[PDB]
Amino acid sequence: SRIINHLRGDPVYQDNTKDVSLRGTFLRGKYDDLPTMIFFTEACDLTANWIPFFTNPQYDILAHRNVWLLNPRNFGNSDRHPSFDLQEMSDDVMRFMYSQKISMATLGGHGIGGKIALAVGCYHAERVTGVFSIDSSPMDQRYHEAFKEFKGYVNALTEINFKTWSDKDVKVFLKENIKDPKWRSIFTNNISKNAKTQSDSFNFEINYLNHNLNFNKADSLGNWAVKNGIYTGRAHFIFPEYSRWVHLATNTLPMHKVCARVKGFGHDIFYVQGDENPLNHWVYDFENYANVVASKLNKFLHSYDGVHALLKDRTEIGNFMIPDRIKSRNDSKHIYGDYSPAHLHHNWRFNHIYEKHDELDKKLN
């Protein structure tokens, strides 16, 4: 109703990658003015499934930030385009932030969604405060067993023809071809019947996706290319102890390799204590996994997100002075010294808070 507001639209196939618009759910915060958080769901996965996580009083995430559960191109209700270049998909978010008048946002993602979130910070860092990745890493996952199943299932989904196939023929096809219960349920709910019951189809572009995965090259979603670069801002990674997607042994190094400010395990990278279970990827379902992600998420949003690199926490804003590099300012008659870096308002561009407070400051003097 009010707290939950998801804009409604129809997907549009686009020939130009720049004329792509993103659509998703918006969760209003408890308080009037709060920074915004943009969260990307797993590929082919529903945004609604994350609502109980972000709408739980025990976690109270909306008390911190407004949440935009946004779908990337070719997913959900967003526009469709064959290219999956993270640079192109990142520009889509920048236009969405512009159309929605968002100066800078906190980015999050689950699995492959985490890659999309981190790519935006890699391509647009000046407008991203932080990144929170869940069971993902900026890494090539083409040869991970978890990805192969997803890559394999999507290929099986290309065999069904809704026009000829009946409703029962589909249900039998999924149970036999899809073994994972969660993926099966996710895919079933992604099937929709267009107006006038003309025919049933998948909400996501099955053709463009299978080609990306089946080709299994740099543009594949499982792959993380060197072209994507480095993320300069705050980044926190949380994944299960026994996870098929992120192996604790070596899959943590890409974080140090790609994220410059990542300190390491125990500070910006954590693992949730758990057993071996293929369903641990979906932390929002299990309270034990979710409670830790929420606590760590609230800690990242409250103390670490949107904090200058050389500062430890948000507590140091206004009391810790950073050294200055010589000959870094235009003024020639400037005595170089330590300074507290400037932290700006989350939407200072599309509001006039600075112009307003300047007047109030004059009234004091």
Partner: protein
């Protein structure tokens, strides 16, 4: 969040979580009168009364420096009992300790009293510091009340009582103003008041309501970085 995984963490050669009688080679063995000529032992049956007199001394010798503060004498007593009640409430089986837990604890409390007799026990110096900071804050409230001025604590109570009325005037569907709802209201005010101390409220914006305070700042000419270089 994180639980110990090793199941044998509390295992000892003497059993599970045994911190009263650790296993050692020279184990206690009995003595027989008919076969025993002489013996050298320090164990006695005087630990009970020493446990009583030690309490009376540690209590009476600490009150010498309380200046008749009745509220402090009663608080100190509760803390003194917590120190003597450790053997009675601990997981450690104090009645099964190696060579007598009674003598062990009594001899330990005697070392604490020796420091108390000199007024050098860290609990004493900690009690003086804690109490002086409390009275300085209570006297500040008294001085502000005698002047008819309003205390920062009463301003919060009055600001919270009126907010409860505003929140319950719209809570008509339900009528259970839970303690949870009352709490988040108070914490929200505390967080804004907490940030107000370092950045007071100049205008209607309120405490810590100026964005310009968070722009680039510099140390004042009269107080530079004394500990390190600046550039």
């Amino acid at each position: 969040g994180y639980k110990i995984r090793n199941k044998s963490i509390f295992w000892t050669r003497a059993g599970w979580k045994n911190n009263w009688h650790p296993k050692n080679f020279n184990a206690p063995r009995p003595s027989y009168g008919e076969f025993t000529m002489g013996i050298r032992c320090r164990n006695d049956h005087h630990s009970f009364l020493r446990y009583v007199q030690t309490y009376r001394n540690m209590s009476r010798h600490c009150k010498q420096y309380f200046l008749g503060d009745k509220q402090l004498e009663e608080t100190f007593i509760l803390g003194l009992r917590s120190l003597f009640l450790v053997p009675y409430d601990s997981q450690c089986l104090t009645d099964q300790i190696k060579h007598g837990g009674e003598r062990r604890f009594v001899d330990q409390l005697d070392r604490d009293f020796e420091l108390i007799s000199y007024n050098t026990h860290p609990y004493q110096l900690f009690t003086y510091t804690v109490r002086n900071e409390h009275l300085a804050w209570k006297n500040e409230q008294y001085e502000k009340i005698q002047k008819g001025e309003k205390t920062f604590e009463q301003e919060l109570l009055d600001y919270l009582d009126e907010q409860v009325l505003a929140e319950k005037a719209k809570l008509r569907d339900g009528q259970n103003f839970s303690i949870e709802r009352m709490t988040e209201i108070a914490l929200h005010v505390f967080r804004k008041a907490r940030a107000g101390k370092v950045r007071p409220a100049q205008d209607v914006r309120g405490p810590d309501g100026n964005v310009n305070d968070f722009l680039e700042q510099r140390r004042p000419f009269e107080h530079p970085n004394p500990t390190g270089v600046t550039h």
